[PDB]
Amino acid sequence: SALAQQLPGTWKMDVTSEDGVRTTGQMHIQPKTPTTMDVTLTGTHADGKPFTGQGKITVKTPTTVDITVTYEDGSTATGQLTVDSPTQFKFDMTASDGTRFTGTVQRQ
């Protein structure tokens, strides 16, 4: 599919919580199966402390994929990536405590 060909690579995260907290990072998507992919999220939170997360990306529609990430401290978040352009997906994830981040991932 198109998602399986486009998603692999390195992307810049640029998201904002519902309370206005902006955080960036790197999303590294690696192929695994024709419909599932490995993903690694790295960067620093708004307090400057680093974060590291690894998870799975699963295709949901020809234009959307599910994404689930477990961070190093055991925190878990699930969300969706939606294709927006040849170089951009919409990013929308929610942590277990209800904190929601919306934004983009752009190809790097």
Method used to obtain the model: X-ray
Range of the domain at 37: 1-108
> What is the per-residue burial (b if ≥16 Cβ within 10 Å, else e) of 45-79?
eeeeeebebebbbebeeeeebbbebeeeeeeebeb
Contacts of 34 (CB under 8 A, 6+ apart): 1, 4
**Structure resolution in Å?**
2.1
Surface-to-core class of residue 80, CB atoms within 10 Å of its CB (0-12 exposed, 13-18 middle, 19+ buried): middle
Written as one string, the DSSP assignment of 32-101 is -SSSEEEEEEEEE-TTS-EEEEEEEEEE-SSSEEEEEEEETTS-EEEEEEEEEETTEEEEEEEETTS-EE
Angle at CA of residue 94, ends 5 and 104, nearest 5°: 45
> For residues 105 and 87, what is the distance between their CA atoms, to the nearest angstrom?
8
70 dihedral zone (left: phi>0; alpha: psi -120 to 50; beta):
beta
- Domain count across the chain: 1
